[PDB]
Design a protein around this ligand. Structure first.
Ligand code: MG
Lengths: 64, 167, 350, 128, 493, 59, 171, 33
RNA sequence: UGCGAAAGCAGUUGAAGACAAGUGCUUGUCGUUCGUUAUAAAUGGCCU
């Protein structure tokens, strides 16, 4: 997941997520939490969705 | 002697519409931001963010209304608070069933069931900013088309009325 | 030593009002003693406080108004300014202020229904009516040089006699406005002057380990109850069924049937609080109704906590054990023991 | 409840109806990098069979590692077998032993049967 | 998110005789000094006390070596004829020695000038003089007179007891731990005789038959005694009075034997046994006395000893040779204003309510090749593989790692003959090894399929492949031959 | 840098107070200062690890 | 009475701070501990403590969100490349700021910092910012809650100190 | 399952099992506040 | 794609519509349909 800083076009990353990111969102009055949807495409038999709520402070999984 | 019963949960629900992007997640974080509501295919789980545990689970099988309605239907969105009226939630389904449920408590066997009147529409999205509610609905080149209606509650008739805005 | 300058349980024993100084200003707060309410809702810490807006102003005496008696819960506060404040906790605002003409500090206060009696450092009695909010009568009785305490004897539904003590105890008749009897008190100033039953009232003094039980009708010392260390607070159960005294060293002592060798009796049961680590937590107040005893201690700096125990089944010497933070390794719910994120998958290592 | 996900095991507690762990039991490009474009054609090793001994202290796992395409060794699947242990308090299985190409070369391990309690107090297994 | 997994080094299936934990420890006795003595060094003993100096008996003298300096610090040369022992006391203060004249002398250890007590034990040679471990005051001396007198230091004029019953030379004496009364002596008769000093004595309580001359008897434990004689050593249990085990791995006749217990090695107990074949081998009593390590020396070994359990310093293995050579192997073991300035670093929160620990442990530095793969530098990762002084195993992984990633052709696009030869050079060598043969097969296949045209125009590349063709052809013969062996080996079964 | 190196300046007169600090006031190597939002409390830290507290009677 | 008398500190008191409303005093130092005291003027007992392993406390400060008064937080920093935040009794909720979003070169240590209030005039919302002191005249401004990098200010020469002023415009 | 009951899994990822007074008003108000 | 072992043994990859480009004609495409079991290439690589 890449945070693009548009002022200078820089960026920060959170790599090695459990799966590819179907969706992203900024969830909070101040953007405290990021809500992400992951897919885990390894399993082709079924679609394996995982909902992740990350604390924007230190980018640690608040709720998986 | 033996008996069969469901025990555990299932895959998280998702807005399985190809056209919509950025609105796939239907889970909502409470106004007080102390717990997250996530709808599954067969239940709705309320997790406490601070402790990272499932404080409450609302099973469709236990409730008669939910059992009939969902057990195909799927929750298209959850809205915090109760539109009709501090821990109520409004659940909008694909067909149009609107259900007012309560978490952080005991699920009442008689929720405030309602039904928005739709003619050959599949409800895709609902949303609000301040007391004003607009609903997006899908109607049918393999490309689906959309109409945007205005939703309001009339107390006298205790029904949801839809007025056309856009297509 | 104790951050809680003064404390007082309500008559029912369910709520405690305590006063402490924040920065240079005294604040008054009320907390629920019981763990959970009757409905089953868990009690919560009450953030609301009443602040005194003047540093010089202080609370000298704290008295509860009977919850059942009056529609609005209230606690009566004596102030060194020379005026008495009636405080309604729910509103969190001082409803009304009784002001004596003089500026002398109030030393004590006692209440029976509408009847309210105080005393100042000038040794002047007063009578106040809560319902009418008026000063009835103010008088000074000769030979009472000091008045460190006041308690109104519970006779019927009216006040016919008052108990007052500075170093010796005196009984005074309101109508005659003269002393009726004199008792030999303590050498030090009297601190507690509660009336256990008819013709039997206890007495205790500052820096003293002895409690004198006197007879109102006769005037002879029935008994002298003795505590292991100095006595700070006193609570009596029923009608002399049991007496619990909070010693200054932080231990609670219970006297069982003190009104039944015979001259000098010692405490029967001793209660203490010690944390799991080993530190002792002093007890600053206690309440005992029929068979339940309530123990209040301070955690943090001024957070009060409470515990209810059945003193009848407790052994003679009992030490409650409480979990207080001490070298607690901080475990955050979103990390495991090794600091790794809980959502993260464990890697493969041969 | 242990689910043999592709190249991993997902440990799920059905009493509490919540996941308890997700462990990679295999080598391969699994979370080292994000596969993109032709890299996405790669197949990670597949955990085919997973079984526990009766006492529950030993975990037996069977893997099939698929070679990359367009090489000489693009038709020799590698069969791997592994033995893991953990104490009950711990939550991560630690690999204790690894057998490369059991039963010979390119011969799959069709069945695994942990031994009963009578034979070597449940510290044995059969592979077929 | 999760931390990046470390690249896992490739480990091929185990081969015979991996390095054992026991072999690793004993291999650390690295530093070797070879000292030359006048005559055969017959006996070697270690002081039971710090600094645990050891005494070597050579010719007509005794020399004590410092443990840290590994050099002579004291020499006892008063002895006129050949010497035969240098055992210390349990307290380590006293040193006793025997002489061919039969006189036994006791000296203050570290004080050669002073002579405490001199005893004329017998007119015959007195080969063995050992202090009693439980009781300090009593000395036992065994002589060619075939009587093992038990002297007392206070009374030197007459032996406290005189044990007899040996029909040949007695050259071995041992005191059983926890049984002070018991004494064990072994003669060249082939019998190990046990005596009870508490009783009247002079007649063995029972005899144990070895069938060969017994060169040394050591009491390994309170109930077990190991006796080495002839071409084997046997361990006996007194409670059963029968041999539990026997090992005859030796070729020449065992001479000396020593035992050390509860030392920081993986093996809790060790038994070093000289062979007289130049071999001293370590036996582990816990495992039925099986071999675990061995050394070889120039000539026959007549004495072996190890530092006691409580060495408290560098350990030592000492081997004695009949040529006089002594072999030693050793396992080596601001301003005050500025400190009042920053004084809080030492504190560890011993008094604080809550302790919070979030620092991540420092991981080992990653090598150059691992960094390139992590940063997706495919071509450079191949280069870092083929550099001088790169471990072969470490080189195999980056080759496998690239193949696993599916980046083999990608690593070989931007190359010419100049930067292709390092790969071919390694492939010329790695093709021999069984482990890297298959990986060499894949990579060489690609480079040919990718640089056929460049091969024609470049001569140097051609000679590489000619030599490579010879080596692979050589391997085909070896691989074929192994199959033929398997064919015959199947016929036998 | 040096001990007892604390002064209080009155405003807007910009005149330093003279009665306090004195020679006897304990301050040590003053390294941290803090005024309470109300009550006029003054807390002064020093290198010895002692936080000494004063009250300004005026507030 | 001394504040530290109840529970002494083992290192210099590098920073002090009074809570905006409540009667608490915070002390931090190279002892790597955050000791909070209940300043009553007569006893001064210790409310709590928090030992931060390997995190020297060069400065500390309370923070109360200007809009949501219920919000309380403690920011601390040292000669380290990370900052700590403590939300406000079995455990302590502590979060670590260690990401500068591409400006890592300009900032080597969080040791000098201050917290102020910023109004987003386009939305009229108010929130906290953490200000840091950079390598060469750089001042880095981070969102107090999310930790995002918002803007940077530069001056010529070596930056030595800075301070914040508010200027009301209207209601 | 090692108990008497049996667990089965469904393609919908559903694991089923087959097997054999003024104070009281004052208390409420204080909690509200 | 079917079956089978992992080796392999048999069998497919069609038609219509529309758009763009070039010159009614040629080619390429399809978030268009029917039927059968049925190269890539926007300088673009993973934090503290
Ligand atoms: Mg000076």
């Amino acid at each position: 997941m890449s945070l693009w800083q548009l002022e200078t076009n820089s960026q920060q990353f959170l790599p090695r997520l459990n799966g590819i990111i179907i969706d992203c969102q900024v969830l909070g009055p101040q953007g405290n939490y990021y809500s992400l949807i992951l897919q885990m495409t390894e399993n082709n038999s079924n679609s394996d969705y995982q909902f992740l709520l990350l604390n924007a402070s230190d980018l640690t999984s608040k709720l998986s | 002697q033996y008996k069969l019963s469901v025990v555990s949960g299932g895959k998280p629900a998702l807005n399985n519409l190809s056209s919509v992007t950025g609105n796939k997640n239907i889970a909502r974080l409470s106004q007080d931001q102390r717990n997250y509501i996530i709808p599954f295919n067969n239940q709705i789980k309320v997790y406490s963010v601070e402790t990272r545990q499932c404080v409450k689970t609302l099973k469709f099988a236990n409730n008669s209304l939910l059992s009939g309605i969902f057990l195909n239907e799927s929750i298209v969105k959850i809205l915090l608070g109760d539109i009709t009226v501090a821990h109520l939630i409004t659940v909008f389904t694909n067909n149009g069933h609107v259900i007012v449920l309560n978490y952080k408590g005991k699920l009442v066997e008689s929720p405030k069931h309602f039904k928005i009147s739709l003619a050959d529409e599949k409800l895709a999205n609902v949303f609000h900013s301040e007391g004003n509610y607009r609903i997006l609905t899908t109607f049918k080149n393999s490309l689906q088309s959309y109409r945007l209606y205005a939703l309001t509650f009339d107390d006298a008739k205790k029904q949801f009325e839809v007025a056309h805005q856009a297509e | 030593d104790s951050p809680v300058l003064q404390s007082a349980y309500d008559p029912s024993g369910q709520y405690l009002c305590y006063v402490t100084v924040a920065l240079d200003k005294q604040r008054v707060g009320v907390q629920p003693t019981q763990r959970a309410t009757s409905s089953g809702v868990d009690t919560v810490w009450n953030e609301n406080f009443l602040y005194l807006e003047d540093s010089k102003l202080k609370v000298t005496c704290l008295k509860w108004v009977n919850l059942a008696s009056s529609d609005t819960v209230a606690i009566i506060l004596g102030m060194n300014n020379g005026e008495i404040w009636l405080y309604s906790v729910l509103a969190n605002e001082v409803t009304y202020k009784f002001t004596t003409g003089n500026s002398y500090e109030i030393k004590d206060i006692d209440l029976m229904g509408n009847q309210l009696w105080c005393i100042d450092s000038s040794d002047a009695f007063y009578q106040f009516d809560l319902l009418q909010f008026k000063l009835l009568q103010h008088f000074r009785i000769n030979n009472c040089v000091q008045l460190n305490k006041l308690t109104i004897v519970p006779a019927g539904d009216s006040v016919a006699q008052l108990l007052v003590a500075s170093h010796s105890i005196s009984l005074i008749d309101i109508e005659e406005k003269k002393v009726v009897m004199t008792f030999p008190g303590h050498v030090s100033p009297v601190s507690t002057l509660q009336v256990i039953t008819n013709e039997f009232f206890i007495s205790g003094a500052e820096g003293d380990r002895f409690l004198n039980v006197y007879d109102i009708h006769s005037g002879m010392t029935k008994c002298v109850l003795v505590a292991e260390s100095d006595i700070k607070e006193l609570s009596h159960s029923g009608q002399a069924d049991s007496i619990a005294v909070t010693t200054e060293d932080g231990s609670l002592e219970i006297f069982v049937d003190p009104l039944v060798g015979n001259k000098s009796k010692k405490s029967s049961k001793k209660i203490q609080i010690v944390s799991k680590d080993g530190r002792k937590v002093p007890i600053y107040n206690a309440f005992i109704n029929k068979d339940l005893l309530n123990v209040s201690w301070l955690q943090n700096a001024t957070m009060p906590y409470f515990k209810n125990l059945q003193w009848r089944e407790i052994p003679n010497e009992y030490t409650v054990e409480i979990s207080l933070n001490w070298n607690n390794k901080n475990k955050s719910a979103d990390r495991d023991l090794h600091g790794k994120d809980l959502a993260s998958a464990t890697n493969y290592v041969e | 409840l242990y689910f043999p996900h592709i190249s991993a095991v997902q440990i799920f507690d059905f009493y509490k109806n919540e996941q308890v762990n997700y462990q990679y039991l295999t080598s391969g490009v699994n979370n080292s990098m994000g596969k993109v474009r032709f890299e996405l054609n790669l197949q990670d090793p597949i955990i085919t069979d997973l079984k526990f001994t009766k006492d529950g202290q030993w975990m037996i796992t069977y893997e099939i590692e698929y070679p990359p395409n367009d090489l000489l060794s693009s038709k020799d699947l590698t069969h791997i077998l592994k033995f893991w242990t953990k104490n009950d308090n711990e939550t991560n299985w630690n690999l204790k032993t690894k057998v490369i190409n059991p039963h010979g070369i390119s011969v799959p391990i069709t069945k695994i049967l942990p031994s009963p309690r009578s034979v070597n107090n449940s510290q044995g297994c059969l592979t077929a | 998110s999760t931390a990046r997994p470390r690249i896992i080094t490739s480990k091929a299936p185990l081969l015979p005789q991996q390095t054992t934990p026991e072999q690793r420890y004993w291999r650390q006795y690295t530093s070797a000094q070879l000292v030359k003595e006048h005559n055969s060094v017959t006996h070697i003993s270690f002081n039971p006390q710090h600094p645990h100096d050891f005494a070597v008996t050579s010719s007509t003298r005794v020399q004590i070596f410092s443990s840290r300096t590994r050099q002579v610090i004291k020499t006892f040369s008063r002895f006129k004829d050949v010497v035969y022992s240098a055992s210390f006391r349990s307290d380590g203060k006293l040193l006793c020695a025997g002489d061919a004249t039969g006189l036994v002398s006791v000296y203050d250890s570290y004080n050669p000038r002073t002579i405490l007590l001199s005893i004329n034990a017998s007119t015959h040679p007195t080969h063995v003089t050992k202090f009693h471990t439980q009781d300090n005051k009593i000395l036992a001396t065994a002589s060619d007179d075939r009587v093992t007198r038990l002297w007392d230091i206070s009374n030197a004029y007459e032996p406290q007891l005189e044990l007899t019953g040996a029909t040949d030379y007695v050259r071995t004496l041992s005191f059983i731990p926890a049984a002070p009364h018991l004494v064990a002596t072994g003669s060249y008769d082939g019998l190990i005789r046990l005596y009870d000093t508490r009783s009247s004595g002079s007649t063995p309580i029972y005899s144990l038959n070895h069938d060969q001359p017994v060169e040394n008897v050591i009491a390994v434990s309170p109930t077990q005694i190991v006796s080495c004689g002839g071409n084997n050593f046997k361990v006996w249990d007194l409670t059963s009075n029968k041999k539990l085990y026997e090992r005859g791995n030796f070729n020449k006749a065992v001479t000396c034997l020593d035992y050390v217990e509860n030392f920081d090695s993986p093996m809790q107990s060790a038994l070093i046994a000289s062979s007289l074949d130049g071999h001293v081998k370590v036996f582990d009593p816990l495992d039925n006395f099986q071999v675990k390590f061995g050394w070889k020396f120039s000539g026959p070994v007549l004495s072996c000893a190890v530092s006691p359990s409580t060495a408290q310093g560098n350990r030592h293995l000492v081997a004695g040779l009949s040529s006089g050579l002594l072999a030693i192997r050793t396992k080596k073991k601001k301003s005050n204003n500025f400190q009042r300035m920053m004084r809080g670093s030492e504190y560890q929160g011993d008094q604080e309510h809550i302790i919070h620990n979030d620092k991540v442990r420092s991981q080992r530095r990653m090598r150059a090749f691992e960094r390139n793969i992590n940063q997706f530098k495919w071509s450079e990762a191949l280069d870092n593989a083929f550099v001088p002084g790169m471990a072969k195993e470490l080189t195999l992984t980056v080759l496998q790692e690239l193949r696993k990633r599916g980046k083999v052709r990608v690593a070989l696009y931007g190359r010419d003959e100049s930067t292709l030869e390092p790969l071919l050079n390694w492939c010329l060598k790695g093709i021999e090894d069984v482990r890297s043969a298959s990986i060499v097969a894949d990579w060489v296949a690609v480079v040919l399929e990718l640089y056929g045209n460049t091969l024609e125009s470049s001569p140097v590349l051609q000679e590489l492949m000619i030599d490579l063709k010879t080596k692979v052809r050589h391997e085909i013969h070896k691989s074929k031959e192994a199959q033929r062996i398997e064919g015959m080996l199947q016929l036998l079964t | 840098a040096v001990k007892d190196a604390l002064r209080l300046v009155h405003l807007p007169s910009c005149s330093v107070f003279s009665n306090w600090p004195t020679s006897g006031t304990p301050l040590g190597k003053v390294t941290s200062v803090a005024f309470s939002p109300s009550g006029g409390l003054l807390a002064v830290g020093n290198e010895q690890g002692k936080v000494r507290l004063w009250k300004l009677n005026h507030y | 009475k001394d504040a530290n008398a109840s529970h002494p500190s083992h290192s210099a008191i590098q920073s002090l701070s009074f809570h905006p409303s409540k009667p608490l005093l915070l002390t931090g130092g190279y002892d790597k501990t955050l000791r909070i005291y209940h300043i009553d003027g007569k006893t001064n007992h210790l409310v709590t403590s928090l030992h931060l392993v390997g995190s020297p406390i060069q400065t500390c400060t309370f923070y109360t969100s200007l809009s949501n008064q219920n919000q309380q937080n403690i920011f601390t920093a040292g000669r380290r490349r990370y900052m700590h935040s403590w939300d406000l009794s079995q455990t302590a909720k502590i979060e670590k700021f260690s990401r500068l979003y591409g400006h890592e070169s300009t900032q080597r240590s969080f040791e000098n910092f201050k917290v102020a209030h910023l109004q987003n005039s386009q939305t009229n919302s108010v929130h906290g910012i953490v200000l840091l002191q950079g390598n060469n005249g750089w001042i880095n401004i981070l969102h107090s809650t999310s930790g995002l990098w918002l803007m940077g200010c530069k001056i010529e020469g070596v930056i030595t100190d800075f301070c914040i002023d508010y200027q009301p415009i209207s209601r | 399952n090692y108990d008497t009951d049996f667990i089965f899994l469904d393609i919908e990822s559903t694991l089923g099992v087959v097997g054999t007074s003024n104070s009281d008003i004052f208390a409420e108000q204080l909690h509200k506040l």
